[PDB]
Amino acid sequence: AEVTQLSNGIVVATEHNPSAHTASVGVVFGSGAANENPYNNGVSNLWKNIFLSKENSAVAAKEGLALSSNISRDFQSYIVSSLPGSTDKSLDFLNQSFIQQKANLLSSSNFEATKKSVLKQVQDFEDNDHPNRVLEHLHSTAFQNTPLSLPTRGTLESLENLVVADLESFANNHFLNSNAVVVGTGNIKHEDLVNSIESKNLSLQTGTKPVLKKKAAFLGSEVRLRDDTLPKAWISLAVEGEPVNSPNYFVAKLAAQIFGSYNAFEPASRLQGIKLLDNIQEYQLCDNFNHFSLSYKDSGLWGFSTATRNVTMIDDLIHFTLKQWNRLTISVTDTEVERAKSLLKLQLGQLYESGNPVNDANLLGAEVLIKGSKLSLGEAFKKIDAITVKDVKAWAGKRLWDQDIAIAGTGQIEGLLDYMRIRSDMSMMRW
Amino acid sequence: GPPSGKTYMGWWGHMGGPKQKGITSYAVSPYAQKPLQGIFHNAVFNSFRRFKSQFLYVLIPAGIYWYWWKNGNEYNEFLYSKAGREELERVNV
Numbered sequence: 200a201e202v203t204q205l206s207n208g209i210v211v212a213t214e215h216n217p218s219a220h221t222a223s224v225g226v227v228f229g230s231g232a233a234n235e236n237p238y239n240n241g242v243s244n245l246w247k248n249i250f251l252s253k254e255n256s257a258v259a260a261k262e263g264l265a266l267s268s269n270i271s272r273d274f275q276s277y278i279v280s281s282l283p284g285s286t287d288k289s290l291d292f293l294n295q296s297f298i299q300q301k302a303n304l305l306s307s308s309n310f311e312a313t314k315k316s317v318l319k320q321v322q323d324f325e326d327n328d329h330p331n332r333v334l335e336h337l338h339s340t341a342f343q344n345t346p347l348s349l350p351t352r353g354t355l356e357s358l359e360n361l362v363v364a365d366l367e368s369f370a371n372n373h374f375l376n377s378n379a380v381v382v383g384t385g386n387i388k389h390e391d392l393v394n395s396i397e398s399k400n401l402s403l404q405t406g407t408k409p410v411l412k413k414k415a416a417f418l419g420s421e422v423r424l425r426d427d428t429l430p431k432a433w434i435s436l437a438v439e440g441e442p443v444n445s446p447n448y449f450v451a452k453l454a455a456q457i458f459g460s461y462n463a464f465e466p467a468s469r470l471q472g473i474k475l476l477d478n479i480q481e482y483q484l485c486d487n488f489n490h491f492s493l494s495y496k497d498s499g500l501w502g503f504s505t506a507t508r509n510v511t512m513i514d515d516l517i518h519f520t521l522k523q524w525n526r527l528t529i530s531v532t533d534t535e536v537e538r539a540k541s542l543l544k545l546q547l548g549q550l551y552e553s554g555n556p557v558n559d560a561n562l563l564g565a566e567v568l569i570k571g572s573k574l575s576l577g578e579a580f581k582k583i584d585a586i587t588v589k590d591v592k593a594w595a596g597k598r599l600w601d602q603d604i605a606i607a608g609t610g611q612i613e614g615l616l617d618y619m620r621i622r623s624d625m626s627m628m629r630w
Numbered sequence: 631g632p633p634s635g636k637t638y639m640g641w642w643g644h645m646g647g648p649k650q651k652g653i654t655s656y657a658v659s660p661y662a663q664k665p666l667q668g669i670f671h672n673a674v675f676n677s678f679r680r681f682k683s684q685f686l687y688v689l690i691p692a693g694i695y696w697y698w699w700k701n702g703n704e705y706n707e708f709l710y711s712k713a714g715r716e717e718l719e720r721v722n723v
Contacts, residue, residue, distance in 0.1 A: 340656065419659030427649040510643030603659045613650070614643035618657055 202563070202573050203389035208402070209376055211393040212567050213383030214559055222385030223267065223556040224289040224392065225278030226297070227564025229380070230373040230409050232353070233272040233346040233495075241321065241353015242361060242369045243270040248320070249304050249313045249366075250277060250296070259292050267557040270351050272338075273443075273496045274565045275373075278557055283386035290395050297374070298403050310363050318359060321352050333424075333433040333608050334504060340422040341437060341605030346415040347495060373409040376402075382564045385556035415497040419603020419622065425612055431486070432510060432610040434517070436621070437502020438602045443494040444570050449543075449582045450594045451492040451501055454527055456539040456546070458503065458520070460489035472538055474526070478519035484512055488520075496569060501598060502605070513614040521624040527595035529627070533588045540583050547583075551576055601626040 202214045232243045247268040249255075259266060263285060267278040277297070279289050296304070325332050335350045342348045383392040417439040441451040458475050462468040463486050469476075479485060485507035493500040503520065507513060551562065566573045604622055608615060640646045708714040709721065 418662045420662065421655070421657045423655045425650045425653060425655075428651055511641065512643075514642060603661055611643060613645055613647075616642075619660065622659060 201575070203393075204567065204572055205389075205393060207393075207397055208405075209396060210380050210567075211383075211389075211396055212380055212563060213387065213389045213392055214563055214573075215388060216385055216556075219283070219386035219554070219556065221280065221556060222283040222286065222383070222387040223278055223280040223560055224286070224293060224384075224387075225267065225276060225382055225560055225564075226293065227380045227382060227561065227568060228275040228277075228374060229273075229378045229565075229568040231271045231273050231275040232349055232351040233415070234373055234409070234412070235349050235353075235369065236412075237349070238357045238360060239365055239369065240349045240357035241317065242365060243275050244321075244352045245314060245317055245358070245361060246270075246275075246366060246370070247277075248317045249309060252304070252309055252313050254306075254309060255296065255304055262288055262292065264288060264292055267560070269561060271561075271565070272347055272351060274561075274568065276561050276564055278382070278560045280557055286387050286391055287395050290392070290399075294399060298401060305363050305366065307363075310366070314358070314361070317352075318355065321355050321358060324352060325355070329429070329431075329433045329609055330504065330506060333435050336422050336424065337435045337437065337502075337605060337607040338500070340420045340607055341417055341439075341500060342415055342498065343418060343420060345417075346412060347498065371404065375404060375407050375409055377407065378409045380564050380568055382560045384559040384563065415495075417498055417603075417605075419605060421606045421618055423607070423612060423615070424609035426609050427611055427613070429610040431506050431508050432513060432608065432612050432615065433504075433506050434513070434606065434608040434612065434615060435502065435504040436517070436521075436604055436606045437491075437500040438598055438604055438625075440492055440499025440501035440598070441494055442499050443496060443566075445494070445499070447590075447594050447598075448494060449579070450586055450590050451494075451499070451598070452547075453536070453539045453543055453583065453586055454591055454595065454599075455490040455492045455501065455503075456543045457527070457531070457535055458490050458523060459542070460487075461485070462487045472535075474532075474535070475520055475523040479516065482509070482512060482515075484509055484516045484519070500605070510611045510614050513612070514616050514620075517615065517621060518624060521621070522627070524595070524599055525625070525627050527591055528600045529592070531588055531591055531595075536586070536588050536591060540586065543583055544580060547579060548576070599625070 200215070202212070204210075204212050232240075235242055247270055250268055251266055256266060259279065263281055265280045267276075267280055269276050277293075279293055281289055339348050339350065381392070381396065383389065441447050445451075457473070459471065459473055460468075461471070461473075461476065461479070463480075463483060469480065479488075485505050486509075488503055488505035490503040491500070505516065505520075507516060509516070551559075553559075563573055602625055604625065606615075606618070606621060638646055709718040
């Protein structure tokens with residue numbers, strides 16, 4: 200009714216839904232693709248993909264289980280999904296996979312069939328998924344020589360250099376209990392799981408903490424992947440944003456909300472009450488964009504992302520947009536702010552209140568790791584609404600106005616201008 | 631706007647050049663660097679290289695020219711001196 204949180208060594212967390220047809224259990228390791236290193240990159244995405252190799256996934260397929268997995272930057276998750284009654288059928292199959300079995304998934308016929316498929320995997324991504332590719336490199340340059348930089352799915356380089364002796368090197372350090380959280384989502388009780396958990400003995404590497412690295416940092420920089428053979432142009436730009444559990448966590452998400460997200464095709468999109476939109480549409484400066492305030496444990500990235508078949512006029516594209524961003528400091532309409540608060544809520548909803556347990560897991564697992572607990576929607580909303588204009592005019596005033604940016608891109612970006620232009624559009628001339 | 635005559639320059643996104651693939655550039659904000667990027671120290675080992683690599687191409691021709699200058703200069707001061715009025719009456723008419 201307010202989400203449960205109790206620890207007997209294994210911090211056991213759950214979240215009940217009485218109208219759910221199914222449920223899900225799993226673990227979340229409080230160390231992700233940003234706890235790795237330059238040459239072991241993709242180790243966390245390698246771990247995910249053995250966990251779903253036909254072997255272990257045929258086991259749980261007779262049982263009636265489905266497994267879910269994802270790696271982030273600050274965190275890393277291993278979830279299993281099934282019918283709510285077969286709730287022990289989950290917990291046991293989890294127990295087998297992470298304390299019982301070890302080299303049953305770590306075969307020299309398994310691992311050389313997973314790594315020979317996480318290699319094709321990260322060779323369609325950087326090959327044909329430019330919007331994320333661009334998005335990923337954006338981190339690489341903004342957070343260069345620092346934790347967040349390492350692409351979550353790992354470089355094809357440090358991904359052909361890795362054997363099983365390396366899957367473990369990360370496992371036995373960062374796959375602990377004092378870095379994990381067990382989650383219960385969907386259609387199960389707190390007294391169903393934490394019972395079935397204290398039912399099982401053993402302890403893996405107790406007392407052990409996972410290790411640390413130099414805290415992340417940010418620096419104004421570019422990286423440009425020109426490719427004049429690609430029909431469009433993809434660009435992503437940002438400033439040093441705000442972390443998870445930062446005073447302006449919501450203030451910053453409200454700002455993103457204002458300019459928001461465009462799709463020049465859906466007539467619905469064309470009518471949004473966004474000021475910037477007035478400009479961009481005249482000549483069709485782009486095909487779409489969208490904003491964001493990506494928050495991570497140590498640092499953040501407020502900016503936006505755009506694709507465009509309009510090559511001669513990208514220079515305006517970036518211009519109109521970064522000028523709008525100036526208003527946030529000097530001239531944002533209050534009535535804009537309300538449409539923000541309003542729309543944030545709708546978005547922040549379909550995020551948190553989707554009828555899909557697997558999401559409510561990672562969400563829970565990550566948050567109850569970093570701050571300890573989760574924060575309720577009513578808590579969030581109570582904050583969103585407190586937000587004045589002055590909220591947004593002092594946040595932009597430090598974060599946005601005349602601060603270093605972080606551009607990245609690919610496709611026909613000859614037209615995308617230089618760094619002393621772009622960066623300079625962070626401000627406006629004053630008397 | 632009537633037709634324009636083709637050249638070998640266009641503006642951004644149609645600059646005129648060949649179709650770039652493979653290169654990947656990286657830079658860093660002019661704010662994000664040491665004021666005085668690299669001055670003195672090893673930035674001057676080049677103020678003698680940017681010199682060496684060329685000086686001959688100037689000195690040699692400057693030389694030829696400055697000695698040729700000095701010569702007939704001397705030669706003129708002579709034939710217009712006492713010791714010279716002889717040669718003059720001959721060279722000059």
